[PDB]
Subunit: 311 residues, 4 copies
């Protein structure tokens, strides 16, 4: 059995995590959030006796690990608190607001031999990891190309936020390699009256061309993933449907009916991994390098665009 604390019950905590762990058997929750009104409503709805208003009062529940869903602003603070207190810590992307804080956090995590899992659901998409072993293995494998497009309609933003809070999803999902700088990388972008409209990062490591694309001034909000091997390719227009091309024939691949929405988006699968990491008390090295790399690449991309625009 496992006991977990959830600090910061905001939009995502309520939209996905809570509903996923609330029904998860053999798991005991310890809800924590500053707003007592919200806290109580939720605790009652999902029948949770372990209530907490001050994240520090969590120590009084001997938890096996905590999950932080609060805003980025208070990520490190809360993360560092449980880490230097010898407690596994889960955190929603982005781990921190800057690459340096990400490095420091992981340093503290190592100085205490504690795991620091960063929530990246797009590494656990059931339909994608089913036809694409590479994504499940987090390697480049036999992939010849992989393009991850996540767009939005009329929704530009400031460089920083755009990259760390949104682009990081396609950027990390495609980061099957461990790209951490802009070396041998091709960064392109457009800007509409002061803001970032579309970002394109693409590079080739080995025999695999990785491409992360985000056009937030697109004609419609949608996310597509295209991957190709030798004489075989897939194109997913969503997380539940797709097309498989082989032998010059096209067929559709899809999740089985009744598969819950939060599962298709990979939260169920991710929590699974998280728990195993929490229980084992250790997160595999490549995952730690994956995490840092993606965050470092974000920083490189930000400073680069910022410098070019300002200059």
């Amino acid at each position: 059995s496992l006991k977990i604390a959830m600090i910061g019950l905001g939009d995502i905590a309520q939209k996905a995590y809570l509903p996923v762990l609330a029904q998860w058997p053999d798991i005991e929750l310890v809800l924590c959030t500053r707003n007592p009104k919200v806290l109580g409503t939720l605790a009652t709805r999902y029948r949770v006796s372990a209530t907490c208003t001050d994240y520090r009062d969590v120590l009084q529940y001997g938890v096996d690990a905590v999950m932080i869903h609060a805003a980025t602003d208070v990520h490190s603070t809360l993360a560092a608190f449980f880490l230097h207190l010898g407690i596994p810590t889960f955190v929603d992307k982005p781990l921190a607001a800057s690459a340096q804080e990400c490095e420091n956090l992981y340093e503290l995590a190592e100085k205490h031999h504690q795991p620091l899992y960063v929530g990246f659901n797009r590494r656990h998409i059931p339909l994608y990891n089913q036809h694409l072993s590479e994504l499940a293995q987090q390697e480049c494998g036999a992939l010849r190309s992989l393009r991850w497009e996540k767009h939005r309609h009329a929704l530009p933003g400031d460089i920083r936020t755009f990259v760390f809070d949104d682009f990081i999803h396609p950027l990390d999902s495609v980061n099957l390699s461990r790209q951490c700088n802009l070396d041998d990388l091709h960064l392109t972008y457009h800007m509409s009256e002061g803001l970032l409209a579309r970002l394109d990062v693409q590079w080739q490591t080995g025999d695999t061309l990785l491409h992360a694309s985000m056009n937030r001034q697109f004609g419609i909000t949608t996310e597509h993933v295209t991957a190709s091997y030798d004489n075989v390719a897939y194109l997913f227009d969503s997380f539940t449907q797709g097309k498989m091309w082989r032998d010059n024939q096209e067929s559709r691949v899809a999740l089985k009916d009744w598969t819950p929405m939060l599962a298709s988006k990979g939260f169920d699968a991710m929590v699974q991994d998280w728990l195993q990491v929490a229980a084992a008390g250790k997160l595999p090295t490549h995952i730690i390098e994956r995490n840092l790399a993606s965050h470092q690449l974000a920083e490189a991309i930000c400073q680069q665009i910022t410098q070019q625009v300002t200059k």
Copy 2:
């Protein structure tokens, strides 16, 4: 009314060109090809009188212009010929096997003040030009991105052939900036057992990201075009259908029913542009520069992969 001579009745000539001109009103055809058997077969099929076997006899019928559909290894020889004799010449892409010859040919055309039209049908695709005026205008306009993909199933080939006889399609089609080198351009490729499998070329001109992609070892033979502007986008999965995305809504855009197949592939629209060009003895400068640019770009790509591969 014009009298056009067709030199070199091969595959493309029989499949597209010939059947299109033999339909055009006020046009007299003068078939010409090495093989006398094939000549007579077609001559009978399209009930044409003016038959010839030696391109030199073509002059006898007092032709108003010539259309060369022979192999690439004989374009220069045939083109130069009618150019010296001052006759508007048409040549099916590619113009020549190298940028050197192309440059010569055009220099030769300028000298004799004759038009030299290069057959690029993907600049006349009715459905695309109806929705992307930038293509009809052959400019970048408001385009924020334009991606042209032309894939094939299990069909790798040698650099030269692959680039000059296939990739030249998506490359030129996307080359609205008249690019003629690898300056600030990204080029990725993948060799397979001695052959070129996939080639990806993209660069940013002003506020437009151009991208030509060709995977000759794709899971299926298909050609997709994707264009985007601010808050507007399009994605065509063929020359007859496509999706339009605007106001965060997806609608379908398609070619009128009963549109002849060859017309959908822009052949009629091209022959029309060509006949006017020949009948006017003039060919706009921007078009000439595009032809030249696309060919020099192809040259640059070949003498890049070949060099690298041999290392």
Copy 3:
């Protein structure tokens, strides 16, 4: 705030109802089922105190209503029981294996002035009722036609089960005219080996053509709904996606993102209506009549077939 008791925790209960209710706000649950093993397993999973094995002890907790999810052959018993005790009763379709029982149960419920709600989730499909008001309001309105197709791959069965436990879905969903017989109705079917393979019931009410189609020996398992008005049509290939044809144009209509799976299948919407009814001790007349009619029609369909076959 209501206290609902769920009697009979079978598959449908564990897959949709239980998960939706155990999450519903201001509702205390009282689980009840024969098997004490499953009873406790579920009770632990959804953290519920009010446990019970005999459908009688349920009255002890002073429930405001009961939801019977047991087998069809136990509905009448359970239903009648609480209906007499004067408690709003909910029963998952079908109400009973015969129209007679249905008529009895409703006649009974009318005496005790209690509401008897039947579980027809396909009447609360959020994406369908959002676009087609006729379905929301349960009328024919401007509908010139409505076709509900629900097919299965290689799954024939006996007339009874096929109709009362399956076909009733599409049949009822289309029964917007309260059809309670075979009057001016066209019934068609096919028997594979010794079972019912496909059934097709279609009739016309005024200016509306209704059609229920089920081919349980179809090449694939899917469900398509097609609705048409004057110069307007819709075709949904699922509960989340569909296309709209208007002004000779095709546009995509889809369910908002992050919508829970069960919700898209109209369960949340149905439970809502159910609770309101239960808390109001009243159930609109037009609803009851539709319920009876659909079961009376199912009865009629079963008979004419069984007869015509044995004949």
Copy 4:
């Protein structure tokens, strides 16, 4: 070798027939039509020497067969003129304006022992006859169901024209059992502003449910064909593409690229047949029984509707 005369060069003759027979090998044409202007233009455009302005000045060319593409009101007259003289005749749907006239023309046909081919391209569609052999053989076969929908956006009309000139297509295509009356058949329809808007004819012959529907007041103009066998089904949304459902999996079936438009709509295959019938002088029985049947069923459906709308 063959020589065919074409009487009546309208829009269909110019859009489909002339072009198809213009490149046909071993076939000499004898263009005939009222209007002189049009005539010469076409004779020059397709380079035909055999000109004509009167369907009577036709035997001066010793034709082997004739093709009438004129209006319906002049079909009989012309059809009889050549069947008298003893000439294989080809007529475009509908054969005549009434079932009476059809039987008449067909009685005069066997009277002079001459074939009377009716142009029904929907029987010779390459993509459909490929996967659906029953349509190629023209018999119910193993089909369990076959639905042919042909809708139009905002285009209602008078019963007569709506039926014989348009509905005749789907009605005949699904008529594999030579249905000729309203026996055991289900007919529904809808009128609007005094015109016919939608028409649906459905009946079951053996183990095959055949359904023809046409809603000329649909949201878009499109034609769909659905066909189901035991545990197998096909859905064609066009004449060149479709979906094949088998083993609960969906795959795409389509026409090879570069297949001319007129070929996909079946004109090539039909003409092919038409010729093999003109040369052979004999037309298979079932084909004659089918054509009559379709026109008889057409009349039945007309008078039937005309009566109720009048009663």
